Design brief:
Helix content: under 10%
Keywords: immunoglobulin fold, all-beta, peptidoglycan binding protein, LPXTG motif, Structural Genomics, PSI-2, Protein Structure Initiative, Northeast Structural Genomics Consortium, nesg, cell adhesion, membrane protein
Number of strands: 6
Protein name: Putative peptidoglycan bound protein (LPXTG motif)
Strand content: 25-35%
Organism: Listeria monocytogenes serovar 1/2a (strain ATCC BAA-679 / EGD-e)
Largest sheet: 4 strands, mixed
PDB class: cell adhesion, membrane protein
Number of domains: 1
Distance between the termini: 59 Å
CATH superfamily: Putative peptidoglycan bound protein (lpxtg motif)
CATH architecture: Roll
Subcellular location: Secreted, Cell wall
């Protein structure tokens, strides 16, 4: 056994943390994954470990999807109704400090 099952298993889950789609197993040295067209779901983020070199075994690439409530395709109520997305939070915990002896 040369391979020893060093592979990457890709899971496709929603923002609720449940796989809404069939998973895959990338046996390629370059585990390069792709998002799927899930009915009623949109890609929320691409996992920080979605693509790279298989350096370890039992690795999981998990894509997160936002649950789409209708396509906004009623045409009766306006057209583009979805709220904004501006990045809040983060860097509220940095810690870094350095006092100089001299």
């Amino acid at each position: 056994m040369d391979t020893n099952n060093f592979t990457v298993k890709v899971e496709y889950v929603d923002a609720d943390g449940a796989e809404i789609a069939p998973s895959d197993t990338l046996t390629d040295y370059h585990y390069v994954s792709t998002p799927k067209d899930i009915p009623g779901y949109k890609l929320r983020e691409i996992p920080h470990n979605a693509t790279g070199n298989i350096t370890d075994t039992g690795i999981i690439v998990r894509y997160i999807y936002d649950k789409i409530i209708d396509v906004s395709y009623v045409d009766e109520t306006g057209k583009d109704l979805l709220p904004v997305v501006e990045i809040i939070n983060s860097e509220a915990a940095v810690l870094e400090h350095h006092h100089h002896h001299h």
